[PDB]
Curated annotation (Swiss-Prot):
The gene is srfAC. One of its GO terms (cellular component) is cytoplasm. Binds 1 phosphopantetheine covalently. The active site is at S1120, D1147, H1230. One of its GO terms (molecular function) is phosphopantetheine binding. SUPFAM superfamilies: Acetyl-CoA synthetase-like (SSF56801), ACP-like (SSF47336), alpha/beta-Hydrolases (SSF53474), CoA-dependent acyltransferases (SSF52777). Pathway: Antibiotic biosynthesis; surfactin biosynthesis. SMART domains: PKS_PP. It comes from Bacillus subtilis (strain 168). It comes from the Bacteria. Residues 1059-1254 are annotated as: Thioesterase. This is Surfactin synthase subunit 3. The lineage of its organism: Bacteria, Bacillati, Bacillota, Bacilli, Bacillales. Keywords: Antibiotic biosynthesis, Ligase, Phosphopantetheine, Phosphoprotein, Sporulation. Residues 968-1043 form the Carrier domain.
């Protein structure tokens, strides 16, 4: 039964590793046309097919690979066997009698048979060709070959030779082709190499790589499936020349150039200079002297890792890349999945870059003069393997293609990427010696959009001291209440006078301009009078928090140069033992009334200091920021983030040492509102706060985020009378904001973000929507006098949507840090996009959302990438702080001699919680990659001087904590699937977290194991995808989250309505079909199931609908075989106790008995001709089979429009129900009922049933329903 004899054998040899993998893929996963290439060539002209066949047979002799077949069945290592002679035939077909469309349809038909047919590498010639005659000089030509013996590059050499021969033979002319070095020579080379050394090289290359999701923030996560989509573009002719000429003067490939510019582009999307992507390489090693003319498999996809060192330029980068290209050459035979199997990274590479050496498309279509025919078109079949592919081929102006999965990426994004690539190509090559980090990558349209389009408008209005704005508010209505504390209220008049008095006494004692005045007040009326007096005297105030330690005050005193100190009397221990030999004056003091209650005429410059408050940033001692009159005008005047008025009553709950208070005081007092100052003991006390709010009729308030959440958890009454609630300081807690929103309504909650150095907040998000699918609350849009720029480290504008350092400019930017020119120069810079202005570098990370609001991404100094996931280390810290009974906790990240980082948690507690207590909590609270790897317990954390944060050197964690609990199969599933692993790897005692390749696994077994689940004791799953899923847990994850029937698998349509219907599948077995029916079901939400092939499929639906709808009247559906399924379903419902309102059968009847299996599954698929097509036979085979071999629910049948004679083994449902068996006649025969215009007539009727409409309700039943739906809230 062997198809060949020993005589036929000319030679034999072993397979390249790549080949070897392709072969096994084939054996185990045939039909999936992974390695089938198919090139269609549109040929216009005269074609001697006979001569072309003969010419193909010459090529057949010329190249061993075409006479090669493979042996694998019973043999330790597979073998390639070259045969002496194989005769090639071109299937010739005439379609001249058909229409254009008909010809096209037939050819598309041949192609699809061809794609599923594949090759049998045991026997077939691994290439075939069909030629279709469309008209007299019009042909379409379909070549097909298996990748196991050729790559695209080779293919062209073959076609070139085919045509020299072709042209020679048809003119009866001699010819000569050069000697061809056999593919066997590459195998010999390959056999001289050390596979483990090559593996080592890659492992070292990728050592310490922290992984990458390219364009992570732009990716859509919605349902799977590839939606192929394409964007063709090219630079200018000039741009292409300078590009091309630069690659040469630097002596590198066009390919390497392209990858250099790409690296810089993704550099700006990944927040990183350690970068990776796939590249296709020639696989043709220098050391085989004529390697460049051999024909067979060489090309390979391999990873490129690029490290953009500080200051690296383009030419530096080119050098870098060309250099490692060489180093890699001897190792390109290693299959990518072996490169990954030892790597650390699942998502190692994400996307790939191709510069097709010389495309089959562009190269082949040249001079019909010699060939006698024109190849008008060429078209290769491309298998969408990555979600984004950059591909380029040379030309006068270079042809670039971004080929992508639009289920993942928006065309809008691929469009921006295009223009950023084009800008990249220009700027990089124009400026090939500048640090790459310095190059600009945004076009003018985008640059304008980002700077101008995303920021507020330019405003005229400008500038006037606070004293002036205050005079405005006072003159408005002197009798209006201005200030209140503990009952005692003051009018704008009274407050003004008490402040003029204080402004004069100050001015007398030599405060004036250029000095700082130290406030030392507990919250009181005086506090506020102090502030005004200081401003009115032309000075700057320094709030001193009475609760601070003596020595932190003494620092602030000296540093600020505070010439004077202004106090209280309940603070009469301003003596205490501070000390302070400066002048100190009380506004307790009754001697104040001696001076005038008119103000002085204190000429003030807006840009002069208004105040100083210190913050902790400069790890060590705290730093004073200088805030300005004009600064403060920016926050409160000419701003359209809502408007405050004479009619508002503010409550200040913010300590006057923090610039939240500057909002409290200035937003009220400069809009003529009432300011209520909460007493010290009310600040963090939600009951007092709620009462003060209630008794004072407060309508506006700023709370820290912690207080806001605190209040929100305590009660609702406090918020019910508020018209506006600002909060900020930490990341908004969405659950809490969602709670506030529902009580308060939209336009009320405002989330505010800002460093001190930007004066309180630079952006604000007024909450209106709160989408159920909401990760983090935006920090919104800049306030009217501020600007925001998302920049890289070198002040380059990031792509719209990329993460970068949030920088601020506009009126709010402070005059910098007291006595510290070094720090000011570091954080504060000249605004590159606006002469005259200053830019503050916040240290925070952010991106613009598509809506122009801003999403906060954490601190630069608090980031860690794990498994391609940017992790914010403060988000895990806060989860530890909240865990009942915790006290302190910090999290460091470190890597060893590699770059391969991990996260250690540290906790002080006592002896309350054991080590794993904390781990159990985070397990489900936080995602897996954010869970710390150790949990060292301390009495306390080290500090270093003024250190809320700690002396980083905590102890290197104890390694017992690396040893964790072995967890063997949890269920009967994993046991049997751990059985095959055990069998395959030949190793006992495997836990569900053990690595397959770490256990001795490799290429074949990874497949061979995924095969044993694929039938032979199993149930089928992706083969080359245990490299994907190396842990049994990860594969239980793949097949429970994305396996069969669950949250994703059984189709849903019409989501944001309500009224559920529960469909059942037709004979073919898939709910995807009623998708086309869902449209004509406008109000009803659909559950389109699949067919479950198991005998106890009964209980699976019993579990499914119980989840999807727990109680009430149930409505089932069934078309075709889905009927007797849906009946054998409601019986169980009401057997297990669940009321079914009604069922709607559609042209299918009762099983009153029983009556070939595959041929009629094929014959009925022949009246119905991978994701939807792969498992289509073996499921339809079983459901069609299941078919051939009472309930309380009302049944409604919609019958065919065609007449019908009933079998004895079929019958009406009349008997099969106790209730109303109503029924109607539809339009269309059994097939066409649920497709086309016939479906749309059958729809209206399906209402009539579901409609019913009359459905007479009782008054008690109606009222109750109403009050029921209401209480829901
Ligand atoms: C976010 C900013 C408004 C800062 C403010 N001082 C706060 O407590 O949140």
């Amino acid at each position: 039964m062997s198809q060949f004899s020993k005589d036929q054998v000319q030679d034999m040899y072993y397979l390249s590793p790549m080949q070897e993998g392709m072969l096994f893929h084939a054996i185990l996963n045939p039909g999936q046309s992974f390695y089938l290439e198919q090139i269609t060539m549109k040929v216009k002209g005269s074609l001697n097919i006979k001569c072309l066949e003969e010419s193909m047979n010459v090529i057949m002799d010329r190249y061993d690979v075409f006479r090669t077949v493979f042996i694998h069945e019973k043999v330790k290592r597979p073998v390639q066997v070259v045969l002496k002679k194989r005769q090639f035939h071109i299937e010739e077909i005439d379609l001249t009698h058909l229409t254009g469309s008909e010809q096209t349809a037939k050819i598309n038909e041949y192609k699809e048979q061809d794609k599923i047919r594949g090759f049998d590498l045991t026997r077939d010639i691994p290439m075939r060709a069909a030629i279709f005659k469309k008209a007299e000089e019009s042909f379409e030509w379909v070549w097909s070959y298996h990748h196991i013996i050729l790559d695209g590059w080779c293919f062209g050499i073959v076609v070139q030779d085919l045509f020299k021969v072709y042209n020679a033979l048809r003119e009866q002319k001699p010819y000569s082709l050069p000697p061809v070095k056999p593919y066997k020579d590459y195998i010999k080379w390959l056999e001289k190499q050390d596979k483990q050394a090559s593996l080592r090289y890659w492992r070292e290359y990728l050592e310490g790589f922290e992984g990458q999701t390219t364009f992570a923030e732009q990716r859509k996560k919605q349902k799977d499936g590839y939606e192929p989509k394409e964007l063709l573009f090219s630079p200018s002719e000039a741009e292409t020349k300078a590009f091309t000429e630069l690659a040469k003067s630097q002596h590198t490939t066009l390919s390497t150039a392209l990858q250099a510019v790409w690296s810089v582009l993704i550099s700006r999307y990944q927040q990183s200079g350690d970068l990776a992507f796939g590249t296709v390489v020639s696989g043709r090693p220098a050391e085989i002297k004529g390697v460049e003319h051999m024909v067979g498999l060489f090309i390979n996809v391999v990873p490129r890792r690029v490290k953009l060192s500080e200051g690296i330029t383009f030419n530096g980068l080119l050098k870098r890349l060309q250099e490692q290209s060489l180093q890699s050459e001897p190792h390109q035979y290693v299959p990518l999945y072996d490169i990954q199997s030892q790597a650390d990274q699942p998502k190692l590479i994400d996307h790939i870059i191709v510069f097709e050496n010389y495309p089959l498309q562009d190269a082949k279509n040249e001079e019909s003069s010699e060939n006698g025919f024109d190849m008008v078109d060429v078209h290769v079949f491309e298998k969408s393997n990555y979600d984004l592919n950059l591909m380029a081929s040379p030309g006068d102006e270079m042809l670039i293609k971004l080929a992508y999965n639009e289920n993942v990426f928006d065309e809008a994004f691929i469009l921006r990427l295009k223009s950023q690539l084009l800008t990249a190509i220009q700027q990089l090559i124009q400026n090939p010696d500048q640090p790459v980090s310095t190059i600009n990558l945004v076009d003018d349209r985008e640059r304008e959009f980002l700077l101008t389009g995303l920021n507020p408008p330019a405003q005229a209005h400008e500038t006037k001291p606070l004293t002036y704005w205050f005079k405005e508010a006072v003159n408005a209505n002197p009798d209006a209440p201005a200030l209140t504390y503990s009952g005692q209220t003051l009018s704008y008049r009274e407050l003004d006078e008490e402040a003029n008095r204080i402004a004069r006494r100050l001015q007398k004692h030599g405060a004036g301009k250029g000095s700082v005045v130290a406030l030392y007040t507990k919250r009181s009326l005086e506090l506020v009078i102090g502030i005004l007096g200081v401003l009115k005297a032309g000075a700057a105030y320094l709030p001193v928090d009475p609760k601070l330690p003596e020595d932190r005050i003494s620092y602030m005193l000296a540093d600020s140069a505070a010439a004077c100190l202004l106090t209280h009397q309940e603070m009469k221990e301003q003596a205490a033992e501070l000390p302070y030999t400066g002048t100190t004056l009380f506004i307790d003091d009754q001697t104040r009334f001696e001076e005038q209650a008119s103000d002085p005429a204190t000429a003030i410059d807006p840009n002069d200091p208004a105040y100083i408050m210190y913050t902790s940033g400069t790890t060590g001692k705290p730093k004073g920021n200088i805030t300005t009159h004009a600064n403060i005008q920016g926050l409160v005047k000419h701003v359209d983030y809502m408007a405050f008025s004479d009619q508002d009553t503010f409550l200040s709950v913010s300590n006057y040492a923090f610039d939240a208070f500057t909002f409290d005081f200035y937003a009220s007092m400069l809009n003529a509102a009432r300011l209520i100052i909460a007493d010290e003991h009310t600040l963090l006390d939600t009951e007092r706060l709620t009462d003060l709010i209630l008794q004072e009729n407060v309508n506006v308030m700023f709370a820290t985020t912690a207080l806001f959440n605190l209040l929100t958890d305590a009660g609702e009454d406090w918020m019910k009378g508020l018209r506006c609630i600002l909060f900020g300081g930490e990341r908004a807690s969405v659950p809490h904001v969602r709670k506030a929103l529902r009580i308060m309504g939209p336009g009320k909650l405002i989330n505010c973000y800002g460093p001190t150095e930007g004066t309180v907040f630079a952006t604000a998000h007024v909450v209106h929507d709160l989408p159920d699918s909401i990760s983090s609350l935006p920090i919104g849009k800049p306030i009217s006098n501020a600007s925001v720029y998302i920049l890289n480290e070198q002040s380059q504008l990031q792509p719209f949507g990329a993460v970068g350092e949030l920088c601020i400019s506009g009126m709010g930017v402070s005059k910098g840090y007291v006595n510290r020119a070094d720090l000011t120069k570091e954080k504060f810079i000249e605004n590159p996009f606006k002469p005259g202005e200053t830019l503050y570098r916040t240290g925070d990370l952010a991106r613009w959302l598509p809506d122009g609001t801003i999403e906060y991404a954490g601190r630069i100094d608090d980031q860690v990438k794990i498994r391609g996931h940017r992790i914010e280390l403060e988000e895990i810290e806060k989860q530890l702080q909240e865990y009942p009974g915790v006290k302190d906790a910090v999290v460091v990240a470190d890597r060893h001699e590699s770059g391969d980082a991990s996260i250690n948690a540290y906790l002080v507690n006592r002896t309350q919680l054991s080590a794993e207590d904390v781990k159990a909590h985070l397990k489900k609270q936080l995602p897996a990659y954010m869970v710390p790897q150790t949990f060292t317990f301390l009495d306390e954390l080290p500090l270093t001087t003024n250190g809320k944060v700690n002396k980083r050197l905590l102890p290197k964690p104890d390694q017992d904590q690396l040893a964790e609990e072995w967890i063997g199969p949890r269920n009967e599933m994993e046991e049997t699937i751990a059985q095959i692993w055990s069998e395959v790897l030949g190793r006992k005692q495997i836990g569900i977290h053990d690595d397959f390749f770490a256990l001795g696994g490799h290429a074949l077994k990874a497949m061979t194991a995924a095969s044993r689940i694929k039938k032979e004791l199993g149930i089928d799953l992706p083969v080359k995808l245990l490299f994907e899923a190396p842990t049994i847990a990860g594969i239980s994850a793949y097949l429970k989250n994305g396996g069969s029937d669950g949250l994703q698998d059984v189709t849903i349509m019409n989501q944001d309505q309500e009224q559920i219907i529960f469909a059942f599948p037709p004979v073919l077995g898939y709910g995807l079909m009623y998708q086309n029916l869902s449209s004509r079901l406008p109000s009803y939400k659909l559950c389109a199931f699949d067919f479950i092939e198991e005998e106890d499929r009964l209980d699976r639906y019993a579990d499914l609908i119980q989840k999807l709808q727990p109680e009430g009247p149930l409505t089932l559906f069934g078309y075709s075989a889905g009927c007797s399924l849906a009946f054998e379903a409601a019986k169980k419902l009401e057997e297990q106790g669940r009321i079914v309102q009604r069922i709607i059968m559609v042209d299918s009847y009762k099983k009153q008995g029983v009556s070939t299996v595959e041929s009629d599954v094929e014959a009925l698929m022949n009246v119905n001709r991978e994701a939807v097509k792969h498992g289509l036979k073996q499921k339809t085979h079983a459901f069609y089979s299941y078919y051939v071999n009472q309930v309380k629910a009302d049944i409604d049948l919609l019958t065919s429009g065609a007449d019908f004679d009933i079998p004895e083994w079929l019958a009406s449902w009349e008997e099969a129900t106790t209730g109303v068996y109503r029924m109607k006649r539809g339009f269309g025969t059994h097939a066409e009922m649920l497709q086309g215009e016939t479906l749309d007539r059958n729809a209206e009727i399906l209402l009539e049933f579901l409609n019913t409409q009359t459905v007479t309700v009782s008054k008690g039943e109606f009222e109750a329903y109403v009050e029921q739906k209401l209480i829901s809230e």
